[PDB]
Coordinates of N, CA and C in Angstrom, one line a residue:
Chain A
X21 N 5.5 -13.9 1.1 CA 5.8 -12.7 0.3 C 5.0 -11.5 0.8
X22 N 4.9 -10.4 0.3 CA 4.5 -9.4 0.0 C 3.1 -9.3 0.6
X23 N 2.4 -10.1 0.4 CA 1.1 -10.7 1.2 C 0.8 -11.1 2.2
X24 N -0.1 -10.5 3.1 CA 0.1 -10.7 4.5 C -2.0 -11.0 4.7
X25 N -2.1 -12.1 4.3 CA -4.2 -12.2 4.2 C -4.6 -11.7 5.8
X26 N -4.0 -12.2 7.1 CA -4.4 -12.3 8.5 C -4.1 -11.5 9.2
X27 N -3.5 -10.2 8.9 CA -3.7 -9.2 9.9 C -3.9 -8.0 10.0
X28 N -4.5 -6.8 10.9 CA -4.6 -5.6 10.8 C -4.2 -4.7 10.6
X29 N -4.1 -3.3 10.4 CA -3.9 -2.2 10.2 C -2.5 -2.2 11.3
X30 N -3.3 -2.2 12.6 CA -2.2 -2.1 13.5 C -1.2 -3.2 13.9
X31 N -1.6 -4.2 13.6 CA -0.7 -5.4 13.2 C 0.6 -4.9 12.5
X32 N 0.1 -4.7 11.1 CA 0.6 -4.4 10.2 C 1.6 -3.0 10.6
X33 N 1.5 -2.5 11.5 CA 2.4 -1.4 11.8 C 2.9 -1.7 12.7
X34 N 2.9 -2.6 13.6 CA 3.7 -3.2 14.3 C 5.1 -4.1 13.5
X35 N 4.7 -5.4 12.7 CA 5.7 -5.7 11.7 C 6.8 -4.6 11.3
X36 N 6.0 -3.5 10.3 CA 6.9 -2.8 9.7 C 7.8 -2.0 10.9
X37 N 7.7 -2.1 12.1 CA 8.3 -1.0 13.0 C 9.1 -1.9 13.5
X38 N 9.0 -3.2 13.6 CA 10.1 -4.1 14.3 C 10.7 -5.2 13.0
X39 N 10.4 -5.5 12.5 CA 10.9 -6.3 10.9 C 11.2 -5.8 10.0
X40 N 10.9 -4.5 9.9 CA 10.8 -3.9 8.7 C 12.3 -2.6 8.5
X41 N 12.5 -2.0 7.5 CA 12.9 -0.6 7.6 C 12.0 0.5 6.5
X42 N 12.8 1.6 6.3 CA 12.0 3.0 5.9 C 11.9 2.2 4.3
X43 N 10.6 2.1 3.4 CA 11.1 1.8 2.2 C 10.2 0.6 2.5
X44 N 9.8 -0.4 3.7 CA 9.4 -1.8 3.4 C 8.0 -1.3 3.6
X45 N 6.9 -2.4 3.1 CA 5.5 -2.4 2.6 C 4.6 -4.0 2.8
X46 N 3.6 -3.3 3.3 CA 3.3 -5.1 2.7 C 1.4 -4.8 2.3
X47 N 0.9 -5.7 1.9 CA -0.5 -5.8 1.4 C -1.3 -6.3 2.3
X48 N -2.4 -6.3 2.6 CA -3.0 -6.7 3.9 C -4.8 -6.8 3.5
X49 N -5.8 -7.8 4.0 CA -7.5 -7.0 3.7 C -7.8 -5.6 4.6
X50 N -8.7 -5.4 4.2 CA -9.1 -3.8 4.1 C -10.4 -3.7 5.4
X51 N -10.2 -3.1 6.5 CA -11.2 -3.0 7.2 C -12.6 -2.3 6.7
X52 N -11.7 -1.2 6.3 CA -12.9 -0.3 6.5 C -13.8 -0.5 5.1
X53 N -13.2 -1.2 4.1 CA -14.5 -1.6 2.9 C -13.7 -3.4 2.6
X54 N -14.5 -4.1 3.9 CA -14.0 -5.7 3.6 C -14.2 -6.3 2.0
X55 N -12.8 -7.3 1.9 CA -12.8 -8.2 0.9 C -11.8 -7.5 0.0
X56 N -11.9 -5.8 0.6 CA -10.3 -5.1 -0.5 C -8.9 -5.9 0.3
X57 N -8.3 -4.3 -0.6 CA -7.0 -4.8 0.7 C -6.4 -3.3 0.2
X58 N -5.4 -3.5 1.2 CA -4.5 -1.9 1.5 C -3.0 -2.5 1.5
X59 N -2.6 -1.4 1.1 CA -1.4 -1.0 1.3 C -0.2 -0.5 2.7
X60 N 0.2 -0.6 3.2 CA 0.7 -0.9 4.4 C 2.0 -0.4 4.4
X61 N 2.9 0.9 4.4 CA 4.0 1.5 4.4 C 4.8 2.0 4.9
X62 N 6.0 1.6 5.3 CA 7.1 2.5 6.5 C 8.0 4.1 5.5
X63 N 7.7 4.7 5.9 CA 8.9 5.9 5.8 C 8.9 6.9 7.1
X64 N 9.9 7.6 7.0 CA 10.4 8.3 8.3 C 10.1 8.0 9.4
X65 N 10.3 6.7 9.7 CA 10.0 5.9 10.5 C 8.9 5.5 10.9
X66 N 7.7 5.4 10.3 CA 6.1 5.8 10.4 C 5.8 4.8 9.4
X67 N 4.3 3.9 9.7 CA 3.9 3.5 9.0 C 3.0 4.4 8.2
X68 N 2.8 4.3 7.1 CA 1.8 5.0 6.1 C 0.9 4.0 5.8
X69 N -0.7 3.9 5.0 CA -1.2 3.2 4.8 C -2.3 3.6 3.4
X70 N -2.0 3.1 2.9 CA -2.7 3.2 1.0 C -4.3 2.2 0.6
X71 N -5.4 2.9 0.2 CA -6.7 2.1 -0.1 C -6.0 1.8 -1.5
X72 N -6.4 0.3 -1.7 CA -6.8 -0.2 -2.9 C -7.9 -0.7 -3.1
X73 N -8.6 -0.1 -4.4 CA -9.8 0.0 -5.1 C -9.7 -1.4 -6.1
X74 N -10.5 -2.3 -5.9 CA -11.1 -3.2 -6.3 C -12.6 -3.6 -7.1
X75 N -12.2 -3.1 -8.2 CA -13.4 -2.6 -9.2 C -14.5 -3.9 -9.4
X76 N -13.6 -5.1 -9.9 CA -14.0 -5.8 -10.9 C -13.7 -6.0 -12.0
X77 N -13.2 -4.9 -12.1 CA -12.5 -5.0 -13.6 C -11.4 -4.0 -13.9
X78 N -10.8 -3.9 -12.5 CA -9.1 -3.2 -12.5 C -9.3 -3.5 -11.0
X79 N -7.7 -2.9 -10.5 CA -7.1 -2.7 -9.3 C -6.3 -1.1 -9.7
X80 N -6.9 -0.2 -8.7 CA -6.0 0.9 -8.6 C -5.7 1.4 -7.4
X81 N -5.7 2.9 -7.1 CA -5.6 3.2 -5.9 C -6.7 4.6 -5.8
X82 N -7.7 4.4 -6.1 CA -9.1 5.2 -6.5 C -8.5 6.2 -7.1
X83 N -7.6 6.1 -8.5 CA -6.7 6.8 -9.1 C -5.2 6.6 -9.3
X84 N -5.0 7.5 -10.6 CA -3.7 6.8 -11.3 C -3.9 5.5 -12.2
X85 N -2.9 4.9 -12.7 CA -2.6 3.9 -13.4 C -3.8 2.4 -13.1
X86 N -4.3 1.8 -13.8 CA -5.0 0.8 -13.8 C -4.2 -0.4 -14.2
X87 N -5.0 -1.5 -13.2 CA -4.2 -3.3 -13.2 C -5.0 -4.1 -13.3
X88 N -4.5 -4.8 -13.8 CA -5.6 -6.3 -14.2 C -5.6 -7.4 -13.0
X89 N -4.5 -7.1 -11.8 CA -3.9 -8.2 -10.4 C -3.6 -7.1 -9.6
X90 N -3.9 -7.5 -8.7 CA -3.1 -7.0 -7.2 C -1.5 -7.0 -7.8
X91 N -1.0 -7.9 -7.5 CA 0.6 -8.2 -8.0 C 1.1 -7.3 -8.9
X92 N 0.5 -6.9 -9.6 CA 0.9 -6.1 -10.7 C 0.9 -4.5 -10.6
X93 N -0.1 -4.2 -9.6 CA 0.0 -2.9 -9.2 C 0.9 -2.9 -8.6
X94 N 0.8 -3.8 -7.4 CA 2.7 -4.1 -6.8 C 3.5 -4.1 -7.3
X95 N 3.8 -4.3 -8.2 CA 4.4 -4.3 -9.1 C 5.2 -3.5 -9.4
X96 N 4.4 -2.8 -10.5 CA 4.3 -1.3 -10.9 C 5.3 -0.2 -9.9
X97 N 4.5 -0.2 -8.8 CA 4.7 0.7 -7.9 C 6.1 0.8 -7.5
X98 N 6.6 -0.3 -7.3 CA 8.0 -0.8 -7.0 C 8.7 -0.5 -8.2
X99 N 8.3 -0.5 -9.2 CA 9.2 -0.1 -10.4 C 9.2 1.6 -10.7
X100 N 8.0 2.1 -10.2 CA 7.8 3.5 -10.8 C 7.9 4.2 -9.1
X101 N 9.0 4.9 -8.3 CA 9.1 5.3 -7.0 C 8.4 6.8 -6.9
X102 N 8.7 7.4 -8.3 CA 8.2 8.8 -8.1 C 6.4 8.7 -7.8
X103 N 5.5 7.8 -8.9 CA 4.2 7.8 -9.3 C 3.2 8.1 -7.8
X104 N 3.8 7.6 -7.0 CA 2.6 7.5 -5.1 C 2.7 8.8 -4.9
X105 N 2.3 9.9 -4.6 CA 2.7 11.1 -4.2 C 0.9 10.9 -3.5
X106 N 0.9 11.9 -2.4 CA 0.4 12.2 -1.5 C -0.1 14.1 -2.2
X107 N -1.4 14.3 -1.7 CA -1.3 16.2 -2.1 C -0.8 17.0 -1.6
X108 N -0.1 16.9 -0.5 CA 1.0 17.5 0.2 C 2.0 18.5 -0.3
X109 N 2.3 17.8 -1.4 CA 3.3 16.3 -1.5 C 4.2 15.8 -1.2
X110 N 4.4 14.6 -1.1 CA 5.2 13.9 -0.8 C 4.9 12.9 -0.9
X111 N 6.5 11.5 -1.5 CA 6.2 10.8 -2.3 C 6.4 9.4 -1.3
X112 N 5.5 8.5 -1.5 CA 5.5 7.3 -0.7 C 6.0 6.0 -1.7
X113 N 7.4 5.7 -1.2 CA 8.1 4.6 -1.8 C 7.6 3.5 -1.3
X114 N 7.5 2.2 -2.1 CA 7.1 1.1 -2.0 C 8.6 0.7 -2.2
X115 N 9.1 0.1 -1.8 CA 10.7 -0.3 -1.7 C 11.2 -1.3 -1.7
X116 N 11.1 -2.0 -0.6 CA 11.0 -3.5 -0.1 C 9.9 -4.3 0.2
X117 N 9.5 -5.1 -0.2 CA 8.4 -6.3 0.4 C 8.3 -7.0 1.5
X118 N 8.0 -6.7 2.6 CA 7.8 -7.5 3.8 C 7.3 -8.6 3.7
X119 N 8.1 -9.9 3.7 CA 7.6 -11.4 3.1 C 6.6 -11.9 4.3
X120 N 5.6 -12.7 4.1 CA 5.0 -13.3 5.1 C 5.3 -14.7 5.6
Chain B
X999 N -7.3 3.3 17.8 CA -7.3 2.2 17.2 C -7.5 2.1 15.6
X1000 N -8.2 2.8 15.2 CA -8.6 2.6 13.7 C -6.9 3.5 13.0
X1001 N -6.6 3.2 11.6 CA -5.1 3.9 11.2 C -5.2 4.8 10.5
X1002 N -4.3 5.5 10.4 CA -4.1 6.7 9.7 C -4.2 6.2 7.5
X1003 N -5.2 7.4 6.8 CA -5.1 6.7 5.6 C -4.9 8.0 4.9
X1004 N -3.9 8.1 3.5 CA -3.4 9.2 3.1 C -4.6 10.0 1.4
X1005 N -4.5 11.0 1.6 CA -5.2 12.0 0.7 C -4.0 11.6 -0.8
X1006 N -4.0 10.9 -1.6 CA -3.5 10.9 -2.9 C -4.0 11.9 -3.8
X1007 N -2.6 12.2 -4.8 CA -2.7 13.2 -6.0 C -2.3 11.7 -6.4
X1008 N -3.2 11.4 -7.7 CA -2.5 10.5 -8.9 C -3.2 11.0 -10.6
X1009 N -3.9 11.7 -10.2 CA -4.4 12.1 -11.7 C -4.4 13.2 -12.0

């Protein structure tokens, strides 16, 4: 599924550029603060890539809506397309799940 | 090598 435990950032943009289309996503661990995990996004042909914040006692995206699971922010996200916005702005859909 | 990570508005 949606869950991808074993590989990198650029890994991860590899997949979505050849498996994937604009809209597909997948979850991944987090280099730069080990034991998280990120977010991993194709639009306009480009991967994008999202921190998730791992409190201990939520999952968010160091802001917005709070989760009790990983899954659920996934969730969420996939249900709510407008809520990801960028300060730009511009809004990053979570769309499809890149199964593992 | 290291990836690009985006500036969020959520609150």
């Amino acid at each position: 599924r949606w869950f991808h435990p074993n590989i990198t950032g650029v890994e991860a943009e590899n997949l979505l550029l050849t498996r994937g289309v604009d809209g597909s996503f997948l979850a991944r661990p987090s280099k730069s603060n080990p034991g998280d995990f990120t977010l991993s996004v194709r639009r306009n042909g480009a991967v994008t890539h999202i921190k998730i914040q791992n409190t201990g006692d939520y999952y968010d995206l160091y802001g917005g809506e709070k989760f009790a699971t990983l899954a659920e922010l996934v969730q969420y996200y996939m249900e709510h397309h407008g809520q990801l916005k960028e300060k730009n702005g511009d809004v990053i859909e979570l769309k499809y799940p890149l199964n593992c | 090598k290291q990836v690009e990570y985006l500036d969020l508005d959520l609150d």
